[PDB]
């Protein structure tokens, strides 16, 4: 059972969301839920929404009994970057990379 769930084009950066993902990597659904709820990060809620989507998918589109479910594979990946021009001193122009990341959560009973 895969029961995959992802949130593409997320505003949060992959480098900053991998830190939150590692905390819940390989932990039980309830433990991950509470850790994300009480984590002091925007990425915490960003990935808690994905975890809720995944568990709802498991409940409805797949087998019930979410109690014996574990987050087996979770990984954060970068997404398309938007180019923005920010004026600087001496007339110099630099480019600001509005980075977006793809987050995928896979939950399986075994």
């Amino acid at each position: 059972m895969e029961t995959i769930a992802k949130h593409r084009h997320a505003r949060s950066s992959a480098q900053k969301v991998r830190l939150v993902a590692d905390l819940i990597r390989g932990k039980k659904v309830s433990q991950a839920l509470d850790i994300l709820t009480y984590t002091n990060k925007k990425a915490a809620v960003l990935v808690k929404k994905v975890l809720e989507s995944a568990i709802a998918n498991a409940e409805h589109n797949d087998g019930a009994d979410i109690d014996d479910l574990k987050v087996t594979k979770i990984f954060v990946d970068e997404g398309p970057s938007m180019k923005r021009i920010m004026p600087r001193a001496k007339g110099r122009a630099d480019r600001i990379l509005k980075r977006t990341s793809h987050i995928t959560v896979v939950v399986s009973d075994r």
Binding site: K83, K90, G91, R92, A93
Partner: peptide, 17 residues
């Protein structure tokens, strides 16, 4: 994606004479 049009003139070199 335009190349920087204006580049400031280099800082004057230190006197090495």
């Amino acid at each position: 994606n335009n190349r920087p049009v204006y580049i400031p003139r280099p800082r004057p070199p230190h006197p090495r004479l």
